[PDB]
Amino acid sequence: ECRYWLGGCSAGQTCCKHLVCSRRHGWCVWDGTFS
Known part of the structure; x- marks a missing residue:
């Protein structure tokens, strides 16, 4: 599932x-x- 603000993405997220x-x-x- 997709993450929200300040969710914490990654290289494969x-x-x-x-x-x-x-x-x-x-x-x-x-x-x-x-920015």
Whole structure:
């Protein structure tokens, strides 16, 4: 299943809609706002 904000993605994980796997933060961040 997809993870939510600050869910904690990985190399083989995914993030729910409106979110992106932040490899820098180490967790799913808001897509469109993150850096």
